[PDB]
Amino acid sequence: IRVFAIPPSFASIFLTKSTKLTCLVTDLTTYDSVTISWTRQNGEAVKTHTNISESHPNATFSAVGEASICEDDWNSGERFTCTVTHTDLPSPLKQTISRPKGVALHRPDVYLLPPAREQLNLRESATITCLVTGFSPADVFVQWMQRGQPLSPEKYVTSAPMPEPQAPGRYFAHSILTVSEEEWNTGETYTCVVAHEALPNRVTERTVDKSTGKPTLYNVSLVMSD
Amino acid sequence: IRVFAIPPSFASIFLTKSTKLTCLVTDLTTYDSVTISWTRQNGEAVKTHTNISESHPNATFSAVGEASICEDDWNSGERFTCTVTHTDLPSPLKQTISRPKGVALHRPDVYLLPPAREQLNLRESATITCLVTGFSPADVFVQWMQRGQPLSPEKYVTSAPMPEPQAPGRYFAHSILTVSEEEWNTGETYTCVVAHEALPNRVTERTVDKSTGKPTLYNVSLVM
Amino acid sequence: IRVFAIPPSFASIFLTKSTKLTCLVTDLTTYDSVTISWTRQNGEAVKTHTNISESHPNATFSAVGEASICEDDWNSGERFTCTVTHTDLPSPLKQTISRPKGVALHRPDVYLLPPAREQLNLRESATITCLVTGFSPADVFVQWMQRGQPLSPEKYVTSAPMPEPQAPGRYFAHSILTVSEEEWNTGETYTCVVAHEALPNRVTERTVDKSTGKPTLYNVSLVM
Ligand SMILES: *[C@@H]1O[C@H](CO)[C@@H](O)[C@H](O)[C@H]1NC(C)=O
Ligand SMILES: *[C@@H]1O[C@H](CO)[C@@H](O)[C@H](O)[C@H]1NC(C)=O
Ligand SMILES: *[C@@H]1O[C@H](CO)[C@@H](O)[C@H](O)[C@H]1NC(C)=O
């Protein structure tokens, strides 16, 4: 009998821009006459929940609450609790979610790496990496754009934040993408954009193409008696 | 009343070449004098395990048995069963474990990338990455060999065998490694040793130095 | 009246991954109803011995069989026993074999050399050499590779572990590989891979090709 609470997430906030908070209840029998409500840091009235979920595959009930908040009061570090009154449990279950933060903040650093040439020999596909390092906290967002139109999410894949061995509590992440060498050997910018809270504009991007090196080759033809 | 066992992983094997099967008896009341045992497919007796574990600080007792077999037998697939006997446990319990032979077999193609040029400006650190793509099945093992002696795994980080979006039956992995700039500027071939059970010798290596990949600037042509 | 066996060897382990044991008989009059007993140090027996050989054509006798033991026992030092029974003498003939551990475990050093300049003028064949030096004991198991495809062992020849002239406790070997010049003129990376027991991963490979001898900084030319 445990209740999982999801605070607002950076990825959903940036993608949908319809900030939502939801806590789901687990390990409860398939009963009814159970109401779920949300409370703020002051425990004020909230919005009615919608989109009731179906029971778990192992024959236990499940439900999700819905409400709306704002960044101006979420960022203050205040707590948020959802009230669940299960029929079986006389004591209602309350879960608290907030953001203590107050941690060493720093801007993420973004680097792109062009595909290796030994991959660019069999002439099937190439992979481009976008390494985001030295950022705290977690909940960063990455997506790839080709000439303005974002790529279909089924194409690229992203890692998950993990600690840095040479930095106390500073995270790290990866992101790769595959394009045909047919397209690569012609031209495209393939921008990688990262959305993190610590950035001054919250958004930075860095792009790379096939012609980003070639440091001014030189040809000399000494001629004698010819 | 949770029973589990840890089959010997590929990394567990190659880390010490000391394949061994252990049983996880956790989420039970803290007790003493607990008996764990194994068996073969035909019911033959097993070797005398020892070096049992202790209780968790979370009011839980962990029992670990050290059962050792040979890699030939384990690959042949001798079906084992962790039998745990204790005063509190009412009845014996059985668990079956093996490998589902019949998986797709493919060779992991390894590509090695140098650090970013824009990173090599702060003169602080570099992150060389070892990308292993298009293998089958999972559980690949990667280590970082500078030259000669190996390096501790507390200073480099490895990903998990995440599935490849383009290749479903195939997978991929990422292994990074930090180093100060002065070490990157005096050689340090920094090879990446990766071992998978589909390569003919089960081990392969790749190397990349700072003076690698640089194109040919001059094209002198003496004329006479 | 002498009986000599064949201990398992490092190269025979890597060449087949089908380890066996063979104990041979010689200097005894040919006979029948001769059985060789295969019991371990602890006294228990092993799988039967097959492939009964034919007596040597020099008025002597021989017998060979097959076994299967995982290398954990051999590394631990489990003394295998081949008790041949002969009608020449009533007392059974018992012999055992083992391995020592008092050996310097230095690592081998591998160098490749390209074909001679004058050989690449007659335009018929070329020979490429892989050299090993400075190891102990005698466990080289050197083989060749191209494009990830193993080559037939007929095309390359390996030498014995000849000792060093100066170094007292070190040995060396050699290996050549004949190859067509027109094939050698278009890539064919042609790596050689050694496998000793003092190597941390027990496998090491080096490679050389045509482009191995270029400054990768400039391309001088002579046009007329
Ligand atoms: C390089 O120099 C040679 C000699 O002058 C000349 O024949 C050749 O065309 C030059 N290559 C380029 C790309 O200019
Ligand atoms: C280098 O010069 C040679 C002639 O000396 C020419 O064949 C070749 O195309 C040149 N390389 C490039 C990249 O143009
Ligand atoms: C260098 O010159 C030789 C001789 O003309 C030519 O075969 C070779 O392709 C050249 N290399 C490059 C990179 O142009």
Side-chain angles (χ1 to χ4, degrees):
Chain A
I1 317 173
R2 38 171 161 83
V3 178
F4 288 174
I6 296 100
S9 68
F10 209 83
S12 182
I13 284 175
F14 209 101
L15 177 66
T16 45
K17 297 210 193 238
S18 162
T19 189
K20 183 169 71 172
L21 73 165
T22 286
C23 71
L24 73 165
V25 290
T26 59
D27 273 330
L28 312 179
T29 78
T30 315
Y31 283 170
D32 213 9
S33 291
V34 176
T35 178
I36 61 171
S37 178
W38 265 101
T39 50
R40 302 207 149 179
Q41 49 265 49
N42 50 5
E44 214 62 33
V46 296
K47 179 62 173 171
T48 63
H49 51 278
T50 49
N51 190 79
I52 295 92
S53 308
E54 191 177 1
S55 164
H56 297 165
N58 55 1
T60 192
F61 208 73
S62 178
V64 286
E66 193 258 336
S68 166
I69 62 100
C70 182
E71 183 67 27
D72 67 348
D73 58 33
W74 177 250
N75 65 348
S76 162
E78 311 310 285
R79 78 193 55 76
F80 265 92
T81 313
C82 53
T83 60
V84 178
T85 64
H86 200 250
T87 59
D88 293 334
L89 283 183
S91 68
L93 290 155
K94 285 214 202 188
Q95 319 278 323
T96 302
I97 47 174
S98 178
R99 298 300 307 272
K101 194 182 180 180
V103 68
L105 263 72
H106 182 47
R107 64 221 61 181
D109 292 331
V110 184
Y111 322 102
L112 278 78
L113 311 178
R117 54 191 100 191
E118 57 262 12
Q119 188 173 15
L120 299 167
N121 288 338
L122 57 86
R123 309 325 188 92
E124 181 65 27
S125 68
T127 189
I128 305 168
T129 70
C130 186
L131 195 149
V132 183
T133 183
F135 64 92
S136 72
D139 291 332
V140 293
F141 187 52
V142 172
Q143 61 183 354
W144 290 67
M145 271 165 298
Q146 166 180 328
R147 275 186 284 98
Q149 313 114 309
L151 276 300
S152 71
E154 68 190 59
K155 293 179 179 179
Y156 71 100
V157 65
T158 61
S159 180
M162 64 184 73
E164 185 87 29
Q166 280 65 41
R170 322 319 289 289
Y171 303 170
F172 166 64
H174 282 289
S175 175
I176 67 168
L177 184 149
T178 76
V179 287
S180 286
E181 191 165 359
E182 197 58 274
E183 320 186 37
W184 173 260
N185 260 318
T186 54
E188 189 36 78
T189 186
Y190 289 133
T191 303
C192 171
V193 58
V194 63
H196 183 43
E197 71 76 21
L199 294 179
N201 190 359
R202 98 179 283 175
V203 172
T204 56
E205 42 190 279
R206 312 189 191 271
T207 197
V208 297
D209 194 7
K210 79 175 298 179
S211 66
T212 61
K214 321 169 148 190
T216 73
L217 68 88
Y218 301 118
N219 182 7
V220 178
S221 179
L222 301 176
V223 175
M224 57 136 299
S225 304
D226 197 359
Chain B
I1 295 106
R2 290 279 160 79
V3 54
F4 272 130
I6 297 89
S9 75
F10 212 84
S12 279
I13 291 165
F14 283 49
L15 264 168
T16 45
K17 274 162 211 63
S18 77
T19 183
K20 54 182 311 313
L21 276 77
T22 182
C23 205
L24 187 139
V25 181
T26 306
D27 288 292
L28 271 75
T29 311
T30 304
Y31 268 57
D32 277 325
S33 82
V34 181
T35 301
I36 300 182
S37 301
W38 280 267
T39 176
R40 321 267 192 239
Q41 174 143 330
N42 79 317
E44 213 165 20
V46 300
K47 78 153 49 173
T48 69
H49 71 93
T50 175
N51 205 29
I52 206 164
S53 53
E54 291 177 353
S55 164
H56 283 268
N58 278 114
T60 310
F61 174 72
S62 178
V64 162
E66 273 85 338
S68 298
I69 48 164
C70 294
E71 288 107 322
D72 191 359
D73 186 74
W74 181 218
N75 220 19
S76 66
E78 206 70 29
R79 186 260 317 155
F80 285 3
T81 286
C82 177
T83 64
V84 185
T85 59
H86 196 24
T87 67
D88 56 1
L89 203 69
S91 72
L93 81 174
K94 295 182 183 294
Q95 289 78 236
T96 183
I97 191 149
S98 68
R99 54 191 40 71
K101 304 295 278 289
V103 309
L105 204 73
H106 282 302
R107 66 180 64 251
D109 304 66
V110 187
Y111 313 109
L112 201 45
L113 319 177
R117 223 181 49 201
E118 69 208 70
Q119 161 75 294
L120 304 171
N121 271 9
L122 279 74
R123 304 176 82 264
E124 167 86 340
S125 49
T127 57
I128 176 172
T129 179
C130 203
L131 176 79
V132 184
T133 61
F135 63 80
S136 171
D139 193 13
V140 188
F141 170 68
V142 182
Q143 206 201 10
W144 278 97
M145 201 55 108
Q146 183 178 2
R147 43 141 180 71
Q149 62 152 10
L151 281 72
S152 46
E154 57 90 23
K155 182 263 289 181
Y156 85 92
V157 182
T158 308
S159 178
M162 311 165 148
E164 181 66 15
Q166 183 65 260
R170 301 185 149 213
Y171 299 75
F172 72 95
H174 298 255
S175 189
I176 62 100
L177 158 68
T178 189
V179 67
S180 295
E181 183 65 13
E182 67 271 15
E183 273 83 9
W184 183 251
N185 289 337
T186 48
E188 271 76 14
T189 59
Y190 281 156
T191 187
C192 171
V193 63
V194 54
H196 184 65
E197 75 187 77
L199 310 161
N201 209 346
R202 297 172 71 188
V203 171
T204 188
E205 307 165 338
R206 298 280 180 284
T207 189
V208 70
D209 194 7
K210 68 175 289 186
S211 77
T212 299
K214 317 309 279 174
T216 183
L217 295 174
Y218 313 98
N219 193 355
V220 179
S221 177
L222 304 173
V223 178
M224 56 183 304
Chain C
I1 313 291
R2 295 284 192 271
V3 164
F4 296 98
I6 298 169
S9 56
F10 194 80
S12 180
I13 283 162
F14 291 171
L15 193 151
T16 58
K17 273 160 201 92
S18 85
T19 186
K20 292 192 294 286
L21 301 153
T22 56
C23 300
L24 62 80
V25 179
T26 194
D27 287 283
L28 268 75
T29 301
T30 178
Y31 267 108
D32 204 76
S33 78
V34 160
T35 314
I36 295 100
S37 178
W38 290 68
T39 65
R40 302 169 66 193
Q41 175 249 313
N42 304 358
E44 61 264 14
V46 292
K47 185 178 183 293
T48 176
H49 47 283
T50 74
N51 192 31
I52 300 105
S53 71
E54 195 264 328
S55 68
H56 272 166
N58 289 337
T60 45
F61 182 76
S62 69
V64 175
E66 277 94 352
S68 283
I69 284 302
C70 58
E71 271 55 50
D72 281 16
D73 293 328
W74 180 218
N75 288 125
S76 64
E78 209 71 16
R79 291 193 297 274
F80 308 97
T81 306
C82 288
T83 305
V84 47
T85 63
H86 210 85
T87 65
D88 280 335
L89 73 165
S91 67
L93 177 63
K94 281 221 170 178
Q95 78 265 11
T96 59
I97 193 164
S98 64
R99 56 160 272 259
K101 63 177 172 61
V103 288
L105 295 183
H106 197 37
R107 68 180 65 252
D109 307 330
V110 192
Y111 314 106
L112 284 170
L113 306 172
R117 181 177 65 83
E118 42 265 30
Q119 192 170 13
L120 316 164
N121 283 336
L122 59 84
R123 213 149 304 266
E124 291 293 327
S125 188
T127 285
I128 185 167
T129 301
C130 178
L131 175 142
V132 181
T133 288
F135 58 86
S136 45
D139 284 341
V140 283
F141 188 78
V142 178
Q143 57 180 3
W144 292 80
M145 271 295 158
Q146 65 182 357
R147 54 176 68 253
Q149 264 300 316
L151 287 181
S152 64
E154 292 83 3
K155 309 194 284 282
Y156 84 84
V157 165
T158 305
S159 66
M162 293 177 182
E164 291 325 308
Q166 293 177 335
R170 316 285 184 76
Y171 319 124
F172 75 88
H174 269 85
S175 291
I176 68 167
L177 160 58
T178 183
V179 66
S180 184
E181 280 211 53
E182 62 96 19
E183 282 287 347
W184 196 74
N185 269 316
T186 44
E188 316 282 359
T189 59
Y190 284 161
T191 175
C192 80
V193 54
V194 63
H196 190 226
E197 81 175 288
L199 294 179
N201 210 349
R202 306 185 158 188
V203 161
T204 292
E205 62 187 2
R206 318 292 172 93
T207 187
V208 297
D209 208 340
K210 308 183 68 171
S211 54
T212 305
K214 310 294 194 287
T216 72
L217 262 52
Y218 46 87
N219 183 7
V220 181
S221 303
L222 297 179
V223 74
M224 311 144 277

